């Protein structure tokens, strides 16, 4: 929850032991009280300008949550926070050395370093590992 | 002022291929299922409400988060007179889901209440030792 946005990547993994600062917990403690049924204690009393906007607000709260669970769901990394993969890093993506990425770098600058290359990494996890391991697992159950 | 040929795969690209060639292709049909004057909004909920259902049924079957998985429910040869290697090497999926369309409801009941319901009362009572 953005408390370490000026910290470094080699140090922000220390405070990330809290559940991304209880990231998703702020949603459930919100939608317990977003679903205060005073909206149902009125039926909004009408259709109003705000309730049009709230409806377009809850949808984005639904969709953009799902696009982050699905991508974690497909990567063999459902529900975890720090998982490793089988994909080898290609040095053509970034010729930065080891410590400069971790000890000597922010996060948002590192986004603009590989925002070009990000989409290639997405396919190169699924079709390289999570499509792939499931067949090789199923072969190991053939016996 | 751009353009190169295909590299990995396309959307629905394996939908004329065999099962053994389409089984390595499932992620492309898995990613783009969700992302893609009120009548856009009425589409943006049906696309969600269809995604949750298919997500939910995988959840009940002990098979959430995996793309493929196996169960212990036995295949019944009354459902298919097809031979084994004809299925995995000759039949496409689009043909295959016209052939087992009628039996589908029997299948889904005979996954949950058959096994994954039963694999929890058996599971919970493997304690006490």
């Amino acid at each position: 929850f953005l408390g370490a946005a000026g910290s470094t990547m080699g140090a922000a993994s220390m405070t990330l032991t809290v559940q991304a600062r209880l990231l998703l917990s702020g949603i459930v403690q919100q939608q317990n009280n977003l679903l205060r049924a005073i909206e149902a204690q009125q039926h909004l009393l009408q259709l109003t300008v705000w309730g049009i906007k709230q409806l377009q607000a809850r949808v984005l709260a639904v969709e953009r949550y799902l696009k982050d669970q699905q991508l974690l769901g497909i990567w063999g990394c459902s529900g975890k926070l720090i998982c490793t993969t089988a994909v080898p890093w290609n040095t053509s993506w970034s010729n930065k050395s080891y410590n400069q990425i971790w000890n000597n770098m922010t996060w948002m600058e590192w986004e603009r370093e590989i925002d070009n290359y990000t989409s290639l990494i997405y396919t190169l996890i699924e079709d390289s590992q999570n499509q792939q391991e499931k067949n090789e697992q199923e072969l190991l159950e053939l016996d | 002022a751009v353009g190169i040929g295909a590299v990995f795969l396309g959307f629905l690209g394996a939908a004329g291929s065999t099962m053994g060639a389409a089984s390595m292709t499932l992620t492309v049909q898995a990613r783009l299922l969700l992302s893609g004057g009120i009548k856009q909004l009425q589409a943006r909920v049906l696309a969600v409400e269809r995604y949750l259902k298919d997500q939910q049924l995988l959840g009940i079957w002990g098979c959430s988060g995996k793309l493929i998985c196996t169960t212990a429910v036995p295949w019944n040869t009354s459902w298919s007179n097809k031979s084994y290697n004809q299925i995995w090497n000759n039949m496409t999926w689009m043909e295959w889901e016209r052939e087992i369309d009628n039996y589908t409801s029997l299948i889904y009941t005979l996954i949950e209440d058959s096994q994954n319901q039963q694999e929890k009362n058996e599971q919970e009572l493997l304690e006490l030792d």
Epitope: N116, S119, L120, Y122, T123 | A1, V2, G3, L32
Partner: antibody, heavy 134, light 109 residues
Framework: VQLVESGGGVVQPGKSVRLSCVVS????????MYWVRQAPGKGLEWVAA????????VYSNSVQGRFLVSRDNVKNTLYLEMNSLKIEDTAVYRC????????????????????????????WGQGTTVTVSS | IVMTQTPLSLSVTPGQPASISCKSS???????????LYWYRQKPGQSPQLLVF???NRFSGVSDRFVGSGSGTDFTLRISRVEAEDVGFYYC?????????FGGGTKVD
């Protein structure tokens, strides 16, 4: 920066030479290149183009299949090899750099196909001249 | 695609404004949000030099009196108070797709 060519001159029909454009200072693997052909007393004709990673090559229709281009990002060179020469190929060749920078290829999600962006030119080399005659 | 221009000869003297337009067959608006039409000038006996890259922006070493505009098909380059060293040619160059062509080059004396 400095941008010239080499290997120019005059040959016969049916022959084959290869020029050599050499850049000076900018990072050469970052940028794509081009080739242009100004005929004497005429306008300009586009010839060719290479990607920055030397993977994408687009030729003109008239000189399609005859010529050859290539890169060497380490040696910072630029080659235009040519084959099956005709007399109407006698003109001024110019080596030219893209104005903007280019990125890496894009890979649209919906179809597994990359995309190399191509925009126009700012730095024309003064260029050699090849004449095809008897 | 095809893209020619007009007028070929404008033999003038310094002190007056004028304009050169390049006419487009295929309309130009790429999906990046810009219209890839590049206006630039050669001198006689010289490799050319960039006047303006886009129809909006300019290049380094360019006088302020070089203005350009146009729709997706109409395209216009206007030179206010035409300077004494405006000799040579003026090519209109597009960058929609391949093969990317040119104009004839308007001669200005």
């Amino acid at each position: 920066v400095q941008l010239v060519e080499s290997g120019g001159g005059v040959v016969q029909p049916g022959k084959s030479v290869r020029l050599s454009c050499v850049v000076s200072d900018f990072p050469f693997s970052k940028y794509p290149m081009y080739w242009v052909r100004q005929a004497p007393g005429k306008g300009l004709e586009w010839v060719a183009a290479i990607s920055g990673d030397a993977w994408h090559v687009v030729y003109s229709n008239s000189v399609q299949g005859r010529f050859l281009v290539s890169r060497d990002n380490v040696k910072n060179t630029l080659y235009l090899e040519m084959n099956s020469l005709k007399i109407e190929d006698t003109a001024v060749y110019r080596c030219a750099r893209m104005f903007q920078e280019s990125g890496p290829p894009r890979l649209d999600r919906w179809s597994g196909r990359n995309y190399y962006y191509y925009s126009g030119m700012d730095v024309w080399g003064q260029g050699t001249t090849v004449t095809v005659s008897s | 695609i095809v893209m020619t221009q007009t007028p070929l000869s404008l033999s003038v003297t310094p002190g007056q404004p004028a304009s050169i337009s390049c006419k487009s067959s295929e309309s130009l608006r790429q999906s990046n949000g810009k219209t890839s039409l590049y206006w630039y000038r050669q001198k006689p006996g010289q490799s050319p030099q960039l006047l303006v890259f886009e129809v909006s922006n300019r290049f380094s070493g360019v006088s302020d009196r070089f203005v350009g505009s146009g729709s997706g098909t109409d395209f216009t380059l206007r030179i206010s108070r035409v300077e004494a060293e405006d000799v040579g040619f003026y090519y209109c160059m597009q960058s929609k797709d391949f093969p990317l062509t040119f104009g004839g080059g308007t001669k200005v004396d």
